[PDB]
């Protein structure tokens, strides 16, 4: 059966128990934590390609205010659905079973100037989901995995103190 399972989880937790936060930029910023998955059970003679996405977490937006995440008012009109291609895409079962798959190279913006970006709202949660698709296949099945350890809120610049201060840290 077909396993996806979150790397570094107990990373991704310290974050989240903050709160995490990515920073966006015009011309794109890396995640760190970065995102990495195990797989198991994908036919290891077949190829299948990995997509990444992130979905909107929430019907609001976020505001930091006297030290704590709350309700900031009503969201921005959602941000154009961009797809990441994970760059060893298409490959064998066995070469994404091989070791852990990442996502490390994915850039996050807040401003829509190409270059295999995703784009996202500022102030805005979203959470982190990947897309395994098959090569060749007449049925074009895809399967989906959400990663809700992985959530954070979009931002320009650090709210919280603590996250600015993990991820020098950890980083
Ligand atoms: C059942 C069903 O809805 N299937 C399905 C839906 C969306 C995709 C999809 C979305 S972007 C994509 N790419 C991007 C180019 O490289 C790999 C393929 N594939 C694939 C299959």
């Given at each position: 059966?077909?396993?996806?399972?979150?790397?570094?989880?107990?990373?991704?937790?310290?974050?989240?128990?903050?709160?995490?936060?990515?920073?966006?930029?015009?011309?794109?910023?890396?995640?760190?934590?970065?995102?990495?998955?195990?797989?198991?059970?994908?036919?290891?003679?077949?190829?299948?390609s990995?997509?990444?996405?992130?979905?909107?977490?929430?019907?609001?937006?976020?505001?930091?205010?006297?030290?704590?995440?709350?309700?900031?008012?009503?969201?921005?009109?959602?941000?154009?659905?961009?797809?990441?291609?994970?760059?060893?895409?298409?490959?064998?079962?066995?070469?994404?079973?091989?070791?852990?798959?990442?996502?490390?190279?994915?850039?996050?913006?807040?401003?829509?100037?190409?270059?295999?970006?995703?784009?996202?709202?500022?102030?805005?949660?979203?959470?982190?989901?990947?897309?395994?698709?098959?090569?060749?296949d007449?049925?074009?099945?895809?399967?989906?995995?959400?990663?809700?350890?992985?959530?954070?809120?979009?931002?320009?610049?650090?709210?919280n103190?603590?996250?600015?201060?993990?991820?020098?840290?950890?980083?």
């Amino acid at each position: 059966e077909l396993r996806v399972g979150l790397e570094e989880s107990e990373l991704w937790l310290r974050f989240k128990e903050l709160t995490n936060e990515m920073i966006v930029t015009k011309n794109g910023r890396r995640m760190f934590p970065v995102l990495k998955v195990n797989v198991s059970g994908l036919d290891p003679n077949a190829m299948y390609s990995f997509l990444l996405d992130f979905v909107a977490a929430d019907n609001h937006r976020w505001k930091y205010v006297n030290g704590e995440w709350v309700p900031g008012g009503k969201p921005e009109p959602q941000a154009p659905s961009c797809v990441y291609i994970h760059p060893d895409s298409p490959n064998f079962g066995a070469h994404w079973m091989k070791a852990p798959v990442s996502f490390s190279k994915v850039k996050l913006t807040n401003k829509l100037n190409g270059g295999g970006q995703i784009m996202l709202n500022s102030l805005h949660k979203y959470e982190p989901r990947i897309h395994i698709v098959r090569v060749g296949d007449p049925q074009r099945m895809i399967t989906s995995h959400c990663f809700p350890e992985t959530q954070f809120i979009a931002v320009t610049a650090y709210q919280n103190e603590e996250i600015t201060a993990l991820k020098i840290k950890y980083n």
